[PDB]
Structures are given as C-alpha cells and as structure tokens.
Design an enzyme around this catalytic site. Structure first.
Site: not given
Ligand SMILES: CCc1cccc(-c2c(F)cccc2[C@](O)(CCCNC(=O)OC)[C@@H]2CCCN(C(=O)CC3CCNCC3)C2)c1
Ligand SMILES: *[C@@H]1O[C@H](CO)[C@@H](O)[C@H](O)[C@H]1NC(C)=O
Length: 334
Positions: A35, A220
């Site tokens: 990340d 990101d």
């Molecule tokens: C990185 C740690 C994190 C933090 C908060 C939520 C998740 C999460 C989750 F727990 C379950 C399912 C899906 C997600 C995410 O989809 C990210 C998956 C991983 N990242 C990726 O594989 O990226 C290529 C979010 C969904 C909520 C909205 N999201 C964001 O706002 C992105 C931020 C998450 C923290 N890092 C900065 C961007 C995506 C993961």
C-alpha cells in the site's frame, strides 16, 4: 547493492491485490496488501478476541511461536476511510520474497467486521514514507534501504486484469521489463513524504473538464478504484452519464463500451483510460447495471484534497516508485 527480489500477487476480482510475506522463525505466512498510501505494517493477532469475527476468518500472528520475537506492546491505532484498526506494536523478523528484515509492526486486536469480513487479505504493508507512519515507526522500505542490499532504491507494481494466469507482481529494487513496454516516463513528487504528484488536468473525450489549473494525484497501490473529491467526481459522473447508488457509480451494461475515454494529464503526456479499463462489464445487457471502478472520496488535509489513482489506473500503467530520486515512473503495462 546488486540484489533484486520480486513477490507474486493474487488478484481477487480486480479489487484486492495481495501477496505472501513471512514473520518469525519459523516463518508464519500472511496474505497482505502492499500500500503506497500508507506506511505502517500490520497483521491480525492471537490477542485479538474471538468477538471480532474478522480475526476468526483470518490467519493470526502468534508471538510465542517465534524465537526472534521482541515484545514492545505500545498501543497503535490506524485510521482508514472505513473506520480504524487498533493493536499494539511488536518486533520480529519479516520475509518479503528474498529479503529478510527486522521490522516493527502492529498486532491488531480490534479488527471490525466492516470492512474486513470481505477481505481476502490478512494484513497490509505500508510502502509510504516515515512522515506518514503512525508512531514515527520506521517503515519497511526504509529498513530494506538501510541494508544496502537492493540494486536501486526503488520498488514497482504490476496489476493484471482478472482473466482466469498471473495476478500481479510487486518488484523490490527495480522493475520487470517483461511486464511493461517502451521506456518509463518519470514524474517528480511534489514533496518528500507522500507518493503524490501534480496533475495538470482531468479530461473526458477531448473536452478537458476538471483539475484545469491543477491539483494533486496520490498514487495508491492499496486503492481498488480511482477516486477524486466529491465535487470533482460528481462533475465527472455527470459527463459520463452514470447514476449514483449508496456507495458506487453505475451505468447500463449495454452503454459501457460507448462511454467516453477519461484522460489524466501527468508530466506533459496524457494518460488515457477507456471504458474497457474503467468499467466492470459483467454482461452487456440493457436489463443490468454495471459498476464503474471510480468513486468519490474527500481525502482530508494534509494529504488531500487529492485524486487517488488506484488499481483501476495501475492496471494499464506499470508504476515504478523511485525512492532514490523522489519520483514516480509510468509505463504501458503488459
Ligand atoms: C488496504 C487496507 C484496506 C483498508 C480498508 C478497506 C480495505 C478493504 C477491505 F477490508 C475489504 C474489501 C475491500 C477493501 C478495499 O477495496 C481495498 C482492498 C485492498 N487494496 C487493494 O487491493 O488495492 C489495489 C477498500 C474498500 C473501501 C474503499 N477503498 C479505499 O478507500 C481505498 C483505500 C484503502 C486503504 N489504503 C488506501 C486506499 C477500497 C482494505
Ligand atoms: C518500545 O519502543 C520505543 C521506541 O520508540 C521505546 O521508547 C520503548 O522503550 C520500547 N519498549 C519496549 C518494551 O521495547
């Protein structure tokens, strides 16, 4: 120098990109998101209660099964947009493909069901700067530079589309030329401390709509979707002609392929994403609604307001993160 190590990534349906790391002697493995938007490392813990059903459904670190463990136990909390995760610091020996470093990381003992019941990954590895790290905890890429092992002080990202194959690939100490073509186009960071560069326009069709005079674009690797300010995204989604819903934007599946290109203007070149890149075409039915891999988020000061060019973007463009020269390199991915 001379070393270069490359970890291999699983792609859960173009929304989560995670790879393996080990902790301890013997190593206890973890599926983790790498990340550039954060700086701390964490995984779930033994001392996580079974009340948190997110911890039941993930692998846990056990301190007492590592001879290299080194208790600290200082409280740690990490804010994400979907609420926080809380734990305590501890130290142990961490493996990332071919490199092994002594690292201070968090043991999460409070891991909410929203969002983590949907999370195929266990942990996260922050690739941002110590400036962003909670506690002033030395981030992992600092410690890998400290070793003087790497070839060049950089790492890089490859995200693939989900074809049903190779999910993706982070490469420490350089870049894989087999997964990009041409040469890199480099863009210097605004400042040290954030993988954030200046964006000079966001365009729809030929018509340059937004960020006309300039705005920031956080790069990101932990983000699934491109994101922008609410006022930026509503003007974009109005132009595309997408409806809002509780949490995402959608279009009729049959309209997707005819939607305009979106161009981001970076270091002089324009970086174009077609409807093929930015839509989730499950079907091409008039009778269905297909999600766009873009959404609103007002990232607070100091980091924002800013766009975040997440996985939706990186999929098309391989991204080298230059820590030596404080710049980012882009290159058409393959
Ligand atoms: C990185 C740690 C994190 C933090 C908060 C939520 C998740 C999460 C989750 F727990 C379950 C399912 C899906 C997600 C995410 O989809 C990210 C998956 C991983 N990242 C990726 O594989 O990226 C290529 C979010 C969904 C909520 C909205 N999201 C964001 O706002 C992105 C931020 C998450 C923290 N890092 C900065 C961007 C995506 C993961
Ligand atoms: C935890 O780490 C900090 C270093 O910032 C130090 O002040 C403290 O003594 C450490 N505690 C233990 C038990 O290692």
């Amino acid at each position: 120098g001379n070393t270069t190590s490359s970890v291999i990534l699983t792609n859960y349906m173009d929304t989560q990109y995670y790879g393996e790391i080990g902790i301890g002697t013997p190593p206890q493995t973890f599926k983790v998101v790498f990340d550039t938007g954060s700086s701390n490392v964490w995984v779930p813990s033994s001392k996580c209660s079974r009340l948190y059903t997110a911890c039941v459904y993930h692998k846990l670190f056990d301190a007492s099964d590592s001879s290299s463990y080194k208790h600290n136990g200082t409280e740690l909390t990490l804010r994400y947009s979907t609420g926080t995760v809380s734990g305590f610091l501890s130290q142990d020996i961490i493996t990332v493909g071919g490199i092994t470093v002594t690292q201070m990381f968090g043991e999460v003992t409070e891991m909410p069901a929203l969002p983590f019941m949907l999370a195929e990954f266990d942990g996260v590895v922050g690739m941002g700067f110590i400036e962003q790290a909670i506690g002033r905890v030395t981030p992992i890429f600092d410690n890998i530079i400290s070793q003087g092992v790497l070839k060049e002080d950089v790492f890089s990202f490859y995200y693939n589309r989900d074809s049903e194959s190779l999910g993706g690939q982070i490469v420490l100490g350089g870049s894989d030329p087999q997964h990009y073509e041409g040469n890199f186009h480099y863009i210097n960071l605004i400042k040290t401390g954030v993988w954030q560069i200046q964006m000079k326009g966001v365009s729809v069709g030929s018509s340059t709509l937004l960020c006309e005079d300039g705005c920031l674009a956080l790069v990101d690797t932990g983000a699934s979707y491109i994101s922008g300010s609410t006022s930026s995204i509503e003007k974009l989604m109005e132009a595309l002609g997408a409806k809002k819903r509780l949490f995402d934007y959608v279009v009729k599946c049959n309209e997707g392929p005819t939607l305009p290109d979106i161009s981001f203007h970076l270091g002089g070149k324009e970086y174009t994403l077609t409807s093929a890149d930015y839509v989730f075409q499950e079907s091409y039915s008039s009778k269905k609604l297909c999600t766009l891999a873009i959404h609103a988020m007002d990232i607070p000061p100091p980091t924002g307001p800013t766009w975040a060019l997440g996985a939706t973007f990186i999929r098309k463009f391989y991204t080298e993160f230059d820590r030596r020269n404080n710049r980012i390199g882009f290159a058409l991915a393959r």
